[PDB]
RNA sequence: AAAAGACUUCA
RNA sequence: GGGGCUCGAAGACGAUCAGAUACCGUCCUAGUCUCAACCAUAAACGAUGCCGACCAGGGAUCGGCGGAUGUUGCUUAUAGGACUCCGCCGGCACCUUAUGAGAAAUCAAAGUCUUUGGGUUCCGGGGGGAGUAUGGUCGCAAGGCUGAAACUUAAAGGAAUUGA
RNA sequence: CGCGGUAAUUCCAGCUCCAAUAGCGUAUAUUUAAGUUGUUGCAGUUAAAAAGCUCGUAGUUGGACCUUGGGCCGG
């Protein structure tokens, strides 16, 4: 199962921060 | 499964109830436990009802208690068949401390702990009589 | 002075009872400590542990103290007193009284062999308080009391000389830990031996034997 | 209860119930002893009793009455 | 009283054999039965199973006999029956 | 199950007169559908959703119960109890007939327990009119090693009160009849009693 | 507000009445004198308080029993009522009139009995 | 947490019923957890009854009452209607 | 709930058991190879050379300058901080000497109150740290 | 009922 | 694709607000709906594996069955059926005690594991890092599934209890 | 775990005491403790922990009649 808002925030940030190195800015 | 454990478990909870028996279906390794009880006089009588025509076999028990003290303080299983955990005549783990006996199916047949030990033949524990 | 209040106190002090064995048999509820003192003046005290309690309360803090005292002989008799009071000394005094009320006998016995003179426990026996399991475990003689400081003391009052003990659960909770050890010893009269399976006639209650004198 | 070397040993043979089945402990102050006298015509006929005990445990289980009723017969 | 099992186990009441399933019984049998059902139109009376299942008709007379239902058969209109079989 | 042995005292045997009082008083009127496992005493379930109690079975219990009361040499040590006004009538008159002490009205906790308290009681037997309402006194007696006999209806707890007598604790003449009969029986063995009724 | 009876007043008021009762009256003025005889109360207002409360209670007693006050005279009345005892008001008239169940038992107990 | 034999709250082999929306806020609620209350009530008043019937044809009429079950989001019921709290034993009612 | 008791089923219990051990610290140290990740090789002691004397402030309700020195291991490139215990000893250490360091008894990891200080000083200049503060022995010249 | 947010260390 | 009534992320507006991007008000797109396709996740819950036997009283209700010269029915009469019943298989669950388990709250199962071993399977094995990093795998995409470690640090967490 | 913010039984010296004693500290690895590896000997309602669900294999596990039961002597 799936827990709490820790995983909710980090889900959104999971692929965003991978793509924030291609973007950079 | 194999019944065996079910009889032992049912016996001790029924003692707390103070019932004069519970009556249940029985099998062939659970024919054995009842006859051993008779020898060490937890039972002074046992009867195997309807083992003749019916779908199953069974036996109502007439059981010691309804007296003063319970005779069977504890009986609790120590593994059914289909497993490898094994003792020898020298290996002997035990419960109780000699007040009780350790139920053992030996080579010849089911006998109590002292009988098997003297003959020097090992086997596999069925349960722990305290 | 002595002075017995209650029918129960009258029976014991006025020499109609000679033994504490009788009291246990007929399950007489002790609540006055003086009763047990007359038959057994040989009881020895021992303040085991004092541990702080704290409140925050409606007008100021009101801090109490638990006091553990075990009173007993060294011959099958343990007794457990726990009292909470705002003063350390008062709690200790009360705990001595309480311990005497709660004296309950302990079976010493043998393992395999009938040996010479009971010094061990007849059976494997367990006592539970909170989550802590404490186990009386067969041991050969001359092993000593194999326990930490505090469980040794309890078993000295019990008169047991040789057992292994092992405990699991929170050992660090001082309050509960002392309580857990007591229960094992009292629960000795809860385990079936063929030796005690033997049927007795039933002694007659002092309430019917001494109606006139009460 | 014997010893290896003669002597009857282990003092305080406890009470031990009848209707309930289990040892009557010292802790169990709740437990009770019921004496029902054997009777003759117009007589209590004391000095003859059927003696029974009842645990504290059965007195909470609710089986206390039921168990006593079975045994209450004067001779069995 | 204290009863688990009866004071006379060997003869229980029929209501306590209606408790336990057919397989579970002390003395197991069909609780179902055969019966002879009686019809004016036929000279002889026809033996029938209690749980009809099929809409059984009497052999000679086309009167009917009973109609089936979820348990033991629901007899239809004016007919009579005795409960017997050898 | 039921007890047999001994010799019947005199009036302890059944009479047509004795059954007449009990059935008139309406002791035999049991409660409705609710009915404990302990009750063998129904035989045929009676119309309008109620069970009546076999009074021949009840007779055996009453006859036996008297034997237990008088078996302590000194008669005063038994205390009777009743909060209820119906049973208060029974309690006071019972105490008059026999040695027995009465505690009428509210029980008050710490009478049976709390030995240090002045109101400490030791009784050999306790008779309660209804253990259902008097449940709190049952608790103190249970801890106090005092047996509790009670006249019980089936929805009243025969549970954890030893010697249950199927009754009609609801009210009417029923409670008073039970105590009246009990008093007559206990006096029958070595008391003030006279032959006849 | 103000004029509620205290615990000290409650205990004393019952006690005085119980063991002075024939002498005691409904009259306020005479029962002030009684409290001088029975106790020393140091101030004036204490005497008046107790005297007033007791007389109110005396009225209630002579109009129905009071919960915590029992007198010799009232106890005697209760005793007289509880000396009567027939069957305890069951009669029914000779032979009972049972309604099955017990019918089967009574038949095999050798008791005739009426039914209904 | 678990103080309840009732499990979560009104869930007995179902988990989810079929949703009503509150009269007050329109939040979805399954029917058994909704809180419904019978407000069968007159149009008039206490006082108003008299006035209408005096100045109307027919003896009293019948008076054609208003019937509404009122749906709450739990929270809404707390502020006025029937929740109020309780004592522990009476909560099993 | 209960564990399998069965003649063949032995295999299930064995396979699961190994995984559990990794939660336990002692087995984890070997299995992951965390010992290698920690600055020591697995050695009893390790030697470094003093880069600097650094004055590390104490954490949270403790206030004090602990006074440490950072050493770079001879074996590795790894720079780490080690505590100099005892009165003086900041003078006795000195830059560019060989210092023998050992763990705290924390078995790796920073001590807690001194941030990032993984080790403590056993001896400086081959003498014994213990001797020097006590004034039992004196440092050799050079 | 919508106007109600912050607030050092040992503690 | 059909289809877009309703409502309605974002946006855009009014108050409130130092900010208000919100609750709250107003406009409203995707979407909501349906169909063929993707997808694979939820507090997808009973936070409670599946299966079997046993240990405890009682009343409802759902389903079927059995027994009533019961009621209603009036079915030509009946049988049925709805109703009242008692017995009963298998239910969803409640109720009250719980012998017993548990840390307690509670629980006829969280019992029958210290009386330690009924059969089978899955998972956890301090808290964080981190459910991420990385690789493999998959997905149309979102991203999922599988899933570490460095490093940090002494408690995280539960239930009950007493204060505020 | 904690102490040291100036009368610190936690520091630094001295004294005195404890305590192993020709031996003792310290580090790393390892065994015990640790039932933290659960064979012996675990937990999963709420603390870490039942897969969304079912089918279902490899694999484990699996009922009963079953030349077995009874009788005699000897020591």
PDB file of C-alpha atoms in Angstrom, chain I residues 9-139:
ATOM      1  CA  UNK I   9       9.545 -26.002   3.304  1.00  0.00           C
ATOM      2  CA  UNK I  10      12.855 -25.562   5.244  1.00  0.00           C
ATOM      3  CA  UNK I  11      14.119 -23.628   2.192  1.00  0.00           C
ATOM      4  CA  UNK I  12      11.650 -20.738   2.705  1.00  0.00           C
ATOM      5  CA  UNK I  13      12.850 -20.084   6.271  1.00  0.00           C
ATOM      6  CA  UNK I  14      16.532 -20.151   5.261  1.00  0.00           C
ATOM      7  CA  UNK I  15      16.248 -17.691   2.361  1.00  0.00           C
ATOM      8  CA  UNK I  16      14.267 -15.065   4.318  1.00  0.00           C
ATOM      9  CA  UNK I  17      16.619 -15.280   7.313  1.00  0.00           C
ATOM     10  CA  UNK I  18      19.656 -13.808   5.531  1.00  0.00           C
ATOM     11  CA  UNK I  19      17.791 -10.626   4.544  1.00  0.00           C
ATOM     12  CA  UNK I  20      16.799  -9.915   8.177  1.00  0.00           C
ATOM     13  CA  UNK I  21      20.448  -9.794   9.279  1.00  0.00           C
ATOM     14  CA  UNK I  22      21.036  -6.641   7.194  1.00  0.00           C
ATOM     15  CA  UNK I  23      18.815  -4.669   9.594  1.00  0.00           C
ATOM     16  CA  UNK I  24      21.154  -5.697  12.449  1.00  0.00           C
ATOM     17  CA  UNK I  25      24.184  -3.371  12.565  1.00  0.00           C
ATOM     18  CA  UNK I  26      26.988  -5.932  13.045  1.00  0.00           C
ATOM     19  CA  UNK I  27      26.137  -8.099  10.022  1.00  0.00           C
ATOM     20  CA  UNK I  28      25.333  -4.983   7.930  1.00  0.00           C
ATOM     21  CA  UNK I  29      28.893  -3.710   8.475  1.00  0.00           C
ATOM     22  CA  UNK I  30      30.345  -6.790   6.750  1.00  0.00           C
ATOM     23  CA  UNK I  31      27.619  -7.451   4.181  1.00  0.00           C
ATOM     24  CA  UNK I  32      27.252  -3.993   2.622  1.00  0.00           C
ATOM     25  CA  UNK I  33      30.953  -3.336   3.180  1.00  0.00           C
ATOM     26  CA  UNK I  34      30.200  -0.243   5.277  1.00  0.00           C
ATOM     27  CA  UNK I  35      33.562  -0.722   7.044  1.00  0.00           C
ATOM     28  CA  UNK I  36      35.293   0.256   3.787  1.00  0.00           C
ATOM     29  CA  UNK I  37      33.001   3.290   3.415  1.00  0.00           C
ATOM     30  CA  UNK I  38      34.044   4.382   6.937  1.00  0.00           C
ATOM     31  CA  UNK I  39      37.581   5.892   6.815  1.00  0.00           C
ATOM     32  CA  UNK I  40      39.420   2.923   8.383  1.00  0.00           C
ATOM     33  CA  UNK I  41      40.184  -0.183   6.324  1.00  0.00           C
ATOM     34  CA  UNK I  42      39.031  -2.471   9.120  1.00  0.00           C
ATOM     35  CA  UNK I  43      42.199  -1.689  11.067  1.00  0.00           C
ATOM     36  CA  UNK I  44      42.600  -1.411  14.846  1.00  0.00           C
ATOM     37  CA  UNK I  45      44.214   2.001  14.508  1.00  0.00           C
ATOM     38  CA  UNK I  46      45.117   4.176  11.561  1.00  0.00           C
ATOM     39  CA  UNK I  47      47.646   6.949  11.183  1.00  0.00           C
ATOM     40  CA  UNK I  48      47.310  10.351   9.551  1.00  0.00           C
ATOM     41  CA  UNK I  49      49.111  13.675   9.297  1.00  0.00           C
ATOM     42  CA  UNK I  50      47.769  16.888  10.820  1.00  0.00           C
ATOM     43  CA  UNK I  51      46.359  19.365   8.332  1.00  0.00           C
ATOM     44  CA  UNK I  52      45.082  21.915  10.810  1.00  0.00           C
ATOM     45  CA  UNK I  53      43.973  22.550  14.356  1.00  0.00           C
ATOM     46  CA  UNK I  54      40.264  23.369  14.088  1.00  0.00           C
ATOM     47  CA  UNK I  55      38.005  24.682  16.859  1.00  0.00           C
ATOM     48  CA  UNK I  56      34.653  22.964  16.571  1.00  0.00           C
ATOM     49  CA  UNK I  57      31.769  24.419  18.591  1.00  0.00           C
ATOM     50  CA  UNK I  58      29.590  22.104  20.715  1.00  0.00           C
ATOM     51  CA  UNK I  59      26.025  21.244  19.710  1.00  0.00           C
ATOM     52  CA  UNK I  60      22.742  22.422  21.165  1.00  0.00           C
ATOM     53  CA  UNK I  61      22.576  23.205  24.986  1.00  0.00           C
ATOM     54  CA  UNK I  62      26.328  22.612  25.403  1.00  0.00           C
ATOM     55  CA  UNK I  63      28.460  25.627  24.615  1.00  0.00           C
ATOM     56  CA  UNK I  64      32.235  25.313  24.503  1.00  0.00           C
ATOM     57  CA  UNK I  65      34.936  24.964  21.896  1.00  0.00           C
ATOM     58  CA  UNK I  66      35.870  21.304  21.884  1.00  0.00           C
ATOM     59  CA  UNK I  67      39.170  21.818  20.043  1.00  0.00           C
ATOM     60  CA  UNK I  68      39.933  19.141  17.492  1.00  0.00           C
ATOM     61  CA  UNK I  69      42.380  18.687  14.646  1.00  0.00           C
ATOM     62  CA  UNK I  70      41.790  17.392  11.130  1.00  0.00           C
ATOM     63  CA  UNK I  71      44.071  14.618   9.944  1.00  0.00           C
ATOM     64  CA  UNK I  72      44.366  13.130   6.477  1.00  0.00           C
ATOM     65  CA  UNK I  73      45.044   9.386   6.562  1.00  0.00           C
ATOM     66  CA  UNK I  74      48.322   8.090   5.122  1.00  0.00           C
ATOM     67  CA  UNK I  75      46.484   5.170   3.473  1.00  0.00           C
ATOM     68  CA  UNK I  76      43.657   7.176   1.906  1.00  0.00           C
ATOM     69  CA  UNK I  77      42.829  10.633   0.574  1.00  0.00           C
ATOM     70  CA  UNK I  78      40.070  10.855   3.215  1.00  0.00           C
ATOM     71  CA  UNK I  79      40.160  13.887   5.490  1.00  0.00           C
ATOM     72  CA  UNK I  80      38.381  13.504   8.821  1.00  0.00           C
ATOM     73  CA  UNK I  81      38.375  15.243  12.192  1.00  0.00           C
ATOM     74  CA  UNK I  82      39.635  13.701  15.415  1.00  0.00           C
ATOM     75  CA  UNK I  83      39.195  15.058  18.939  1.00  0.00           C
ATOM     76  CA  UNK I  84      42.180  15.909  21.141  1.00  0.00           C
ATOM     77  CA  UNK I  85      41.137  15.021  24.729  1.00  0.00           C
ATOM     78  CA  UNK I  86      42.567  16.595  27.882  1.00  0.00           C
ATOM     79  CA  UNK I  87      43.949  19.886  29.181  1.00  0.00           C
ATOM     80  CA  UNK I  88      46.418  21.327  26.703  1.00  0.00           C
ATOM     81  CA  UNK I  89      46.936  18.718  23.963  1.00  0.00           C
ATOM     82  CA  UNK I  90      46.154  21.227  21.214  1.00  0.00           C
ATOM     83  CA  UNK I  91      49.738  22.369  21.805  1.00  0.00           C
ATOM     84  CA  UNK I  92      51.004  18.759  22.015  1.00  0.00           C
ATOM     85  CA  UNK I  93      49.478  17.714  18.677  1.00  0.00           C
ATOM     86  CA  UNK I  94      50.894  20.364  16.257  1.00  0.00           C
ATOM     87  CA  UNK I  95      50.553  20.492  12.479  1.00  0.00           C
ATOM     88  CA  UNK I  96      52.361  17.941  10.311  1.00  0.00           C
ATOM     89  CA  UNK I  97      53.175  15.305  12.964  1.00  0.00           C
ATOM     90  CA  UNK I  98      52.024  11.696  12.745  1.00  0.00           C
ATOM     91  CA  UNK I  99      49.011  11.039  14.937  1.00  0.00           C
ATOM     92  CA  UNK I 100      47.510   7.646  15.720  1.00  0.00           C
ATOM     93  CA  UNK I 101      43.720   7.757  15.970  1.00  0.00           C
ATOM     94  CA  UNK I 102      41.116   5.201  17.006  1.00  0.00           C
ATOM     95  CA  UNK I 103      37.296   5.234  17.199  1.00  0.00           C
ATOM     96  CA  UNK I 104      35.222   6.622  20.081  1.00  0.00           C
ATOM     97  CA  UNK I 105      33.532   3.342  20.915  1.00  0.00           C
ATOM     98  CA  UNK I 106      30.760   4.597  18.611  1.00  0.00           C
ATOM     99  CA  UNK I 107      31.952   2.064  15.973  1.00  0.00           C
ATOM    100  CA  UNK I 108      32.252   4.693  13.248  1.00  0.00           C
ATOM    101  CA  UNK I 109      29.803   7.619  13.039  1.00  0.00           C
ATOM    102  CA  UNK I 110      30.144  11.120  14.487  1.00  0.00           C
ATOM    103  CA  UNK I 111      30.060  11.209  18.289  1.00  0.00           C
ATOM    104  CA  UNK I 112      27.051  13.530  18.342  1.00  0.00           C
ATOM    105  CA  UNK I 113      27.902  16.558  20.451  1.00  0.00           C
ATOM    106  CA  UNK I 114      30.970  17.294  18.330  1.00  0.00           C
ATOM    107  CA  UNK I 115      29.626  17.498  14.709  1.00  0.00           C
ATOM    108  CA  UNK I 116      31.463  15.356  12.150  1.00  0.00           C
ATOM    109  CA  UNK I 117      34.209  14.160  14.506  1.00  0.00           C
ATOM    110  CA  UNK I 118      34.470  10.460  13.840  1.00  0.00           C
ATOM    111  CA  UNK I 119      37.638   9.614  15.785  1.00  0.00           C
ATOM    112  CA  UNK I 120      39.691  10.561  18.824  1.00  0.00           C
ATOM    113  CA  UNK I 121      43.439  10.843  19.366  1.00  0.00           C
ATOM    114  CA  UNK I 122      45.241   7.958  21.065  1.00  0.00           C
ATOM    115  CA  UNK I 123      48.751   9.380  20.819  1.00  0.00           C
ATOM    116  CA  UNK I 124      50.711  12.203  19.249  1.00  0.00           C
ATOM    117  CA  UNK I 125      54.363  12.057  18.167  1.00  0.00           C
ATOM    118  CA  UNK I 126      54.641   8.364  19.133  1.00  0.00           C
ATOM    119  CA  UNK I 127      54.768   9.226  22.848  1.00  0.00           C
ATOM    120  CA  UNK I 128      51.292   8.519  24.257  1.00  0.00           C
ATOM    121  CA  UNK I 129      48.743  11.331  24.676  1.00  0.00           C
ATOM    122  CA  UNK I 130      48.038  10.050  28.205  1.00  0.00           C
ATOM    123  CA  UNK I 131      51.626  10.556  29.351  1.00  0.00           C
ATOM    124  CA  UNK I 132      51.980  14.088  27.960  1.00  0.00           C
ATOM    125  CA  UNK I 133      49.052  15.904  29.665  1.00  0.00           C
ATOM    126  CA  UNK I 134      49.756  14.115  32.941  1.00  0.00           C
ATOM    127  CA  UNK I 135      53.398  15.280  32.736  1.00  0.00           C
ATOM    128  CA  UNK I 136      54.639  11.708  33.185  1.00  0.00           C
ATOM    129  CA  UNK I 137      56.667  11.936  29.987  1.00  0.00           C
ATOM    130  CA  UNK I 138      57.823  14.770  27.739  1.00  0.00           C
ATOM    131  CA  UNK I 139      57.663  14.977  23.938  1.00  0.00           C
TER     132      UNK I 139
END
